[PDB]
Design a protein around this ligand. Structure first.
Ligand SMILES: *P(=O)(O)OC[C@H]1O[C@@H](n2cnc3c(N)ncnc32)[C@H](O)[C@@H]1O
Ligand SMILES: [Mg+2]
Ligand SMILES: [Mg+2]
Lengths: 985, 147, 76
């Protein structure tokens, strides 16, 4: 009973059983500051049964530094009371409550307990209870640029899924007598030692088909071993194997036992000596607070730092810790104790919310047990950070001024950012910018562009949008929401509904880009990423890239004249199947789904487009007869969809659907088995239908069968939609119409001059004249996965399952069919929060203008396994041109709008290079091998004139420059690479 | 993409392919027309086959789209000109040149593969009645490839 | 020398190398064991991304070292 219209993208990450168990779990959250509210928001969006908040502390102004559900009108009111109202709106299936008083025995009502902003004695008191009563306990802390997480799920935690990957499966070629399983040609099993597999369809060894898992001993990328199969048989042929994932038992220690001998999770292997330092430092913070009436050290105070370091020494001595304390790092922890950064809050809240989901679903591997993190490389160095500049000013940015200072706040308030995309990452980025105070000064501005509209499935991870906002523009809603969060952003956000690409360069032109300070990408495709990367390279602007997939995520930073661009590296491409496999010899459900999608396009989209283009273009037939691969196909489509098989009622649509069923599931299979009988052999004597090729069998139509009826219904409905008729869903009419159907006889054909042109002419003139059909059009079907009443996914599922039945492939359901056909990207709110936090931690590095490349970090993570890793960006490659140092990425030539001859002469005289090729856009302006006449005609023209002439398209008035690619050869003839040319018009 | 495309074009200029000749259409570098000569020891002897090559915006990180324009009677080439070649669907790597693709297509022409066919009827004729396949291929290359 | 490579999806790989091996040889070995072309591999050791043309000793990679094999993602 899960609402798949809302949890569509999250179900592809977690699953149905996981979310069913998750919707029966109660979560208590202690603390309602930025970290707590982030955790509660992510939990409410995830879909737990209910959330209870406990925070009776009255609101303070500084609390607004990372709490985005608090306003300045709420000062003096308990934080939970003012937060519950806004949290109750995120998800309608998750009630949110408040408790004014907490007792120990009251904790038994909750599946998970999250603790923030609590002293160590209270944490020990709570954990001593939750540990012996088997309640999951998570404790999180965020101090300036430092963070800590602790998880304790009990002594006998059971984890069903450990890595979150789909089970591995593969086709076998042979199994010897000693269990040596071999894969097919050039196929990798992908297993690891100790995995368990089960076999099916193994011929010659039926015993392996029982279904008992067996140990795997990997011997190579193509073979493995399972043991001894002497008794089961001598040798086995063909078959498939599927991995079996076994539950694991994880044993946690209590907080009291874990303080003495902690187990660390390392977010970065470059600094493996720090977590032991942070373990002492956070305990010293708790002791200091207990010794000063719950007051943390004041910002950048040396007396408090000295006292804190004395506490650290005392704690390290007491715990028998054999670690030499790094005084600078520990005192840094002391200085930033009162810091409250929205980026750290977002990062830790995403991590902790994922841990809560792990606790409530018993899926994915949890943290064991301490996770200490720092982003100390983000501390500014271009400004003064002292006790005078970091003291509070009684404003909403006190939690950030306590870390960065007032001068850095002035630097932040003057940013002019450009955000591309307004989805999940875009919403998180806008919220982080609003909390940080970005572009709230006299010279600050924010621009956000996005061409899409809000849908129901977007509300599951884009928390700025409500159900009332469905159908509106994403950018307008996001700007309004963040202007509500921070009122100082009123009049300083501009929203566009333009797609960023070659067609929007009149809006995001030179004037627009020259005023920016940085560009942040929040996109979902690589083409737009590459385009924005090229624009940033040309204008020399910093770029912040980020991406997510399920529980995985990454963030990258591109810095002018320092690092390489986003397009300097390659990613694995999308996998496309061979056409022969798809058309004739499928063996996976993905092949049949691709075939079904192509069938949908070929039945309901292409013929309609041809018919419509015939009735619009007066010279369509003449052009198509010579500019098409199959003009005969176009003519046949037009004839069939106009005259021959035009339905005058829905019954004719039903009969048409029945005919198409026969055509695509009974007759083509008969023809295929006529060409390649089941007993046929290859050229080497091997059977033809063996291994990856599965022998099909024709389907006979049976109305009582569910898949056949589904196909008929969906096909008839889509045909009626094409012709604008009134469809029906009652099975009575279908059964009545299909009862009186006489299939035409079919017999597969054995096969065995220039008059065909006359036949094509006769077909063409037989069509009704376009003049007789004015104002008549057929409605094409545009694929739409997200609507469940247009019969698109229904038709694709029915066709895919029927073709699977043809080849004896295991059919799927509508859920997996929608996942595959729709090319849906699994999405999570926790991963979005983590990536936004990392991006906003790099943003402050960009604002400070750090020059060294070791101060920046590209981040990668997978929350399913609890893996975090960071690495320095790659420096842009250098080169030598005319004995000069040239950056291969960020350098260019600036030339006036000279002539082609003058450009060549300039490159000869100045750089000592001979120009061989000159191109602009997708045109070849000049090549060394062109005939002398063409060159002599093209030499005395200016570059703009040459481009206009070659492209036959005048340059637009807003076009202020041209980018030219040039390939040149040196005097010796060696090819030397040079940077691009920027011609100024 | 432009740099590598021009490098390939110049290399084609620097070495006569003899059996092939590819070049941009007009002045567009993302649309080439290539010519292939039927091998002498093949049913397509003395035939000129035109192919259209479409370079994607992501070249060389995505395969070029190569389609026959001349009608050919081959088990691995259908009526739309689609070619059953692995290096064009999922075995493409950013290290293959157009000359290699043309050599692969010529090798495909000189001997078909009926065991993994794209046109089952032509493959059936090839496997069972070879002489009829020879006559049909000769007729098709005389009718369409010569003009 | 024997080193370990951990993927972003949790898989573990064991490579038998020597301190004088270049990063290209290690990438070729990873391709052999995984089928990932060297130009698409992102290897991280101790917070540094390994670049082609250098040796293991340039990064002070010794026996039982752990590398991370990562990749970029396209959602958002
Ligand atoms: P996620 O898939 O949740 O949201 C991605 C958002 O990015 C926007 N987007 C994609 N492609 C473009 C271009 N080319 N220009 C501007 N915005 C883009 C989508 O509309 C989503 O809102
Ligand atoms: Mg959308
Ligand atoms: Mg998307």
């Amino acid at each position: 009973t899960i609402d798949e219209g809302l949890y569509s993208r999250q179900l592809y990450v977690l699953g149905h059983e996981a979310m069913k168990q998750m919707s029966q779990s109660n979560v208590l959250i202690i603390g309602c500051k930025g970290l707590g509210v982030e955790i509660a928001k992510n939990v409410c969006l995830a879909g737990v049964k209910s959330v209870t908040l406990y925070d009776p502390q009255p609101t303070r102004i500084e609390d607004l530094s990372s709490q985005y559900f608090l306003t300045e009108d709420d000062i003096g009111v308990p934080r939970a009371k003012v937060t519950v109202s806004k949290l109750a709106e995120l998800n309608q299936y998750v009630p949110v409550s408040v408790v004014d008083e907490l007792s120990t025995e009251y904790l038994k009502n909750f599946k998970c307990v999250v603790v923030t902003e609590t002293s160590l004695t209270k944490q020990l008191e709570i954990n001593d209870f939750t540990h012996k009563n088997h309640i999951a306990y998570i404790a999180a802390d965020s101090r300036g640029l430092f963070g800590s997480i602790f998880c304790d799920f009990g002594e006998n935690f059971i984890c069903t899924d450990t890595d979150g990957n789909e089970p591995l499966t593969g086709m076998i070629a042979s199994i010897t007598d000693d269990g040596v399983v071999t894969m097919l040609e050039e196929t990798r099993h992908g297993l690891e030692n100790g995995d368990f597999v089960k076999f099916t369809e193994v011929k010659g060894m039926p015993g392996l088909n029982d279904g008992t898992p067996r140990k795997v001993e990997v011997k190579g990328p193509y073979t493995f071993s399972i043991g001894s199969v002497k008794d089961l048989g001598s040798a086995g042929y063909n078959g498939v194997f599927t991995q079996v994932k076994v539950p694991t038992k994880i044993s946690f220690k209590s907080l009291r036992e874990s303080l003495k001998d902690p187990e660390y999770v390392y977010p970065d292997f470059g600094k493996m000596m720090r977590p032991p330092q942070y373990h002492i430092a956070f305990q010293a913070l708790s002791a200091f607070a207990d010794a000063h009436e719950g007051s943390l050290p004041r910002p950048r105070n040396d007396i408090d730092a000295a006292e804190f370091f004395e506490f650290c020494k005392k704690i390290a001595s007491t715990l028998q810790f054999d670690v030499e304390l790094d005084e600078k790092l520990i005192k840094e922890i002391s200085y930033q104790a009162r810091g409250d950064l929205v980026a750290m809050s977002a990062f830790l809240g995403g991590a902790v919310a994922q841990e809560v989901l792990k606790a409530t679903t018993s899926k994915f591997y949890p943290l064991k047990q301490y996770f200490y993190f720092d982003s100390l490389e983000s501390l500014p160095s271009s400004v003064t950070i002292s006790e005078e500049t970091c003291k509070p000013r009684g404003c909403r940015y006190d939690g950030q001024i306590a870390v960065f200072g007032s001068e850095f706040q002035e630097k932040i308030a003057s940013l002019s950012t450009f955000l591309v995309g307004a989805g999940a990452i875009g919403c998180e980025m806008l919220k982080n910018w609003a909390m940080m105070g970005v572009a709230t000064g006299e010279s600050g501005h924010i621009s956000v562009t996005d061409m899409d509209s809000i849908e129901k499935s977007n509300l599951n991870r884009q928390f700025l949008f409500r159900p009332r906002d469905v159908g509106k523009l994403k950018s307008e809603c996001a700007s309004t929401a963040v202007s509500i969060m921070n009122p100082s952003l009123t009049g300083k956000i501009t929203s566009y509904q333009e797609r960023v690409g070659p067609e929007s360069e009149g809006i995001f032109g030179d004037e627009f880009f020259e005023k920016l300070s940085l560009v942040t990408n929040a996109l979902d495709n690589v083409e737009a990423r590459m385009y924005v990367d090229r624009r940033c390279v040309f204008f020399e602007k910093p770029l912040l890239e980020s991406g997510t997939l399920g529980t995985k995520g990454n963030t990258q930073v591109v810095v002018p004249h320092l690092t390489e661009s986003y397009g300097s590296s390659q990613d694995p491409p999308e996998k496309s199947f061979p056409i022969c496999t798809l058309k004739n010899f499928p063996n996976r459900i993905e092949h049949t789904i691709a075939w079904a999608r192509d069938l949908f396009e070929g039945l309901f989209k292409q013929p309609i487009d041809n018919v419509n283009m015939y009735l619009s273009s007066p010279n369509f037939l003449e052009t198509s007869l010579k500019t098409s691969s199959n003009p005969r196909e176009v003519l046949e489509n037009i004839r069939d969809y106009l005259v021959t098989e035009k339905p005058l009622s829905f019954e004719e649509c039903i009969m048409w659907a029945r005919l198409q069923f026969d055509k695509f599931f009974n007759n083509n299979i008969q023809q295929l088995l006529f060409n390649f009988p089941k007993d046929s052999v290859t050229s080497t004597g091997q059977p033809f239908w063996s291994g990856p090729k599965r022998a099909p069998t024709p389907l006979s139509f049976d109305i009582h069968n569910r898949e056949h009826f589904d196909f008929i219904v969906a096909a008839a409905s889509l045909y009626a939609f094409n012709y604008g008729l009134k469809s029906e869903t009652d099975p009575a009419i279908y059964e009545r119409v299909l009862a009186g159907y006489n299939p035409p006889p079919f017999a597969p054909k054995s096969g065995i001059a220039n008059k065909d042109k006359q036949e094509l002419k006769s077909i063409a003139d037989s069509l009704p004249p376009p003049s007789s059909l004015v104002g008549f059009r057929l409605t094409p079907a545009e694929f739409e996965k997200d609507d469940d009443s247009n019969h698109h996914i229904d038709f694709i599922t029915a066709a895919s399952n029927l073709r699977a039945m043809n080849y004896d492939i295991t059919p799927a359901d509508r859920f997996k069919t929608k996942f595959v056909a729709g090319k849906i990207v699994p999405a999570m709110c926790t991963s979005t929060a983590v990536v936004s936090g990392l991006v906003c931690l790099e943003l402050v590095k960009l604002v400070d203008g750090k020059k060294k490349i070791e101060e920046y970090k590209n981040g990668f993570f997978n929350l399913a396994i609890g893996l975090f890793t960071f690495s320095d960006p790659i420096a842009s490659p250098k080169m030598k041109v005319n004995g000069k140092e040239i950056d291969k990425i960020w350098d260019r030539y600036n030339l006036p709008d000279c002539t082609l001859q003058e450009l060549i002469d300039y490159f000869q005289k100045e750089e000592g290079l001979e120009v061989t090729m000159l191109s602009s856009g997708v045109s070849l302006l000049y090549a060394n091998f062109q005939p002398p006449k063409k060159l002599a005609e093209r030499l005395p023209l200016k570059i703009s004139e040459l481009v206009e002439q070659i492209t036959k398209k005048k340059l637009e008035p807003f076009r202020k420059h041209l980018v030219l690619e040039i390939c040149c050869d040196d005097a010796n003839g060696e090819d030397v690479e040079v940077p691009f040319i920027c011609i100024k018009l | 993409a432009l740099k590598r495309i021009n490098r390939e074009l110049a290399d084609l200029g620097k070495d006569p392919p003899s059996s092939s000749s590819a070049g941009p259409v007009g002045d567009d570098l993302f649309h080439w027309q290539a010519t292939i000569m039927g091998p002498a020891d093949s049913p397509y002897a003395g035939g000129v086959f035109f192919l259209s090559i479409h370079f994607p915006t992501d070249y060389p990180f995505k395969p070029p789209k190569v389609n026959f324009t001349t009608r050919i009677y081959h088990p691995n080439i259908n009526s739309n000109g689609s070619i059953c070649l692995d290096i064009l669907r999922d075995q493409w790597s950013p290290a293959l040149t157009i000359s290699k693709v043309l050599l692969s297509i010529s090798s495909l022409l000189t001997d078909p593969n009926p065991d993994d066919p794209l046109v089952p009827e032509i493959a059936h004729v090839y496997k069972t009645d070879r002489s009829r396949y020879e006559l049909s291929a000769r007729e098709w290359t005389r009718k369409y490839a010569i003009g | 020398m024997q080193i370990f490579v951990k993927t972003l999806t949790g898989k573990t790989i064991t490579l038998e190398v020597e301190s004088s091996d270049t990063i290209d040889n290690v990438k070729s070995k990873i391709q052999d064991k995984e089928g990932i072309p060297p130009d698409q591999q992102r290897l991280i050791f101790a917070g540094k991304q390994l670049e082609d043309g250098r040796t293991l000793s340039d990064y002070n990679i010794q026996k039982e070292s752990t590398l991370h094999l990562v990749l970029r993602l396209r959602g958002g």
